[PDB]
Design a protein around this ligand. Structure first.
Ligand code: HEM
Ligand SMILES: CC1(C)[C@@H]2CC[C@@]1(C)C(=O)C2
Ligand SMILES: [K+]
Ligand SMILES: [K+]
Length: 407
């Protein structure tokens, strides 16, 4: 096929599995199901796909976790597939490896960490409620557009002190970096995001506010002033994290709940199980998949990896691995040991995971208490999309207003 890069001389012929992370063949069964094909009976722990330029793929949690822990061999310098995107990718602190990464990660943690989340609690609560109550009497909604996007994005824009009217442009840009449609290369989308930030960063370094951008722009890294370029590379990352993570996850979760009245009932009858349900949904509907680049020739699990080789280490796959969780595709809110790497693993563990969990738990609680019974619009053929971050194209929901409650 013209979409297959010639197999490099060092890659064993028997390890070839032409998986396309941007258009997996079994996508119609669900994106997680599509990626799970990499864990079928006769698929090795480590395979090579000739798609998207050619790269390795660790298919089991054991190797995914090991690779993410070994930053000396598996560098974050070129973390995205295809290589062109990975090479243009220079966000901070994600494109850096420890020890260099740390001073910047500390600053980022200060702007989106737990302390910040705690302060945002009220506003997160208020927005969730206002959005749901407004939808409640209508008996229907386009979940992706009416809640999944506005809820987490507005909260991020509030945190970043950015005009909500700027969302359409920024969201288009972020999506081109995670699930490109062809209109822009990763490099072009990144350049536009940086172009957007440059004057805002300059403005806030002159007259700082209390928003995340001002904090980053006027911050220090281990005692010395952060530069304008560094602030830009950090703020670009924050924007992507805030506009294309939780937004997609909420849709996967709500699609599932709309299709499973039993699970909805469980959370309605036992509201205290919501935090645990949140973690199980994070495992079952994990959605991120980036990777690393080999810093030198290295034998890993009996496979000769060559310097420069890219390896996709799907955060999504660890928790779906039957070797980590029995009956992985089954959603069990009572699951005893919820194992996963949905928020990454190693030195780059997600900094916004605390904000993410709050947004998810608040959504589940506030939605179920107002709209306890809902379902997918009759006949709707839900479509998923695959990429660095997978998502749901559209999620039409319906419900009888008579069954709702105006809390
Ligand atoms: C469902 C929600 C989320 C998921 C599944 C998710 C997942 C991840 C993953 C897998 C990584 C590490 C990638 C790597 O190792 O290369 C990461 C890093 C990060 N995430 Fe999230 N994230 C979520 C929400 C957020 C939010 C809301 C923000 C806030 C802006 C955010 C900010 C970050 C930052 C700053 C990093 C980089 C940390 C570093 O490189 O050291 N994330 N996230
Ligand atoms: C892989 C990620 C989820 C992580 C936060 C946004 C993201 C797309 C990155 O570029 C680093
Ligand atoms: K070969
Ligand atoms: K790079």
């Amino acid at each position: 096929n013209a979409n297959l890069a010639p197999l490099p001389p060092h890659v064993p012929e028997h390890l070839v599995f032409d998986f396309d992370m941007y258009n997996p063949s079994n996508l119609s069964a669900g994106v997680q199901e599509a990626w799970a094909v990499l864990q079928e009976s006769n698929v090795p722990d480590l395979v090579w796909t000739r798609c998207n330029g050619g790269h390795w793929i660790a298919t089991r949690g054991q190797l995914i976790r090991e690779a993410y822990e070994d930053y000396r061999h598996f560098s974050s310098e070129c973390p995205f597939i295809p290589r062109e995107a990975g090479e243009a990718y220079d966000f901070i602190p994600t494109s850096m490896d420890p020890p260099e990464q740390r001073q910047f990660r500390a600053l980022a943690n200060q702007v989106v960490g737990m302390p910040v989340v705690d302060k945002l609690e009220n506003r997160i609560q208020e927005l969730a409620c206002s959005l749901i109550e407004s939808l409640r009497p209508q008996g229907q909604c386009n979940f992706t557009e009416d809640y999944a996007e506005p809820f987490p994005i507005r909260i991020f824009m509030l945190l970043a002190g950015l005009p909500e009217e700027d969302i359409p442009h920024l969201k288009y840009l972020t999506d081109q970096m995670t699930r490109p449609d062809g209109s822009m290369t990763f490099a072009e989308a990144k350049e536009a995001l940086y172009d957007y930030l440059i004057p805002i960063i300059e403005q806030r370094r002159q007259k700082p506010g209390t928003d995340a951008i001002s904090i980053v722009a006027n911050g220090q890294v281990n005692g010395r002033p952060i530069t304008s370029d560094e602030a830009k590379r950090m703020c670009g990352l924050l924007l992507v994290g805030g506009l294309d993570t939780v937004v997609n996850f909420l849709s996967f979760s709500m699609e599932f709940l709309a299709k499973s009245p039993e699970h909805r009932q469980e959370l309605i009858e036992r509201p205290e199980r919501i935090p645990a349900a949140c973690e199980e949904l994070l495992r079952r509907f994990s959605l991120v998949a980036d990777g690393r680049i080999l810093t030198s020739d290295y034998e890993f699990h009996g496979v000769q990896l060559k310097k420069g080789d890219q390896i996709l280490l799907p955060q999504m796959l660890s928790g779906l691995d039957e070797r980590e969780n029995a009956a992985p595709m089954h959603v069990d809110f009572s699951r005893q040991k919820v194992s996963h790497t949905t928020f990454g693993h190693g030195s780059h563990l997600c900094l916004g995971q605390h904000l993410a969990r709050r947004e998810i738990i608040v959504t589940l609680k506030e939605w179920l208490t107002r709209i306890p019974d809902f379902s997918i619009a009759p006949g709707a053929q839900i479509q998923h999309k695959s990429g660095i971050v997978s998502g749901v194209q559209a999620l039409p929901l319906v419900w009888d207003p008579a069954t709702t409650k105006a809390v």
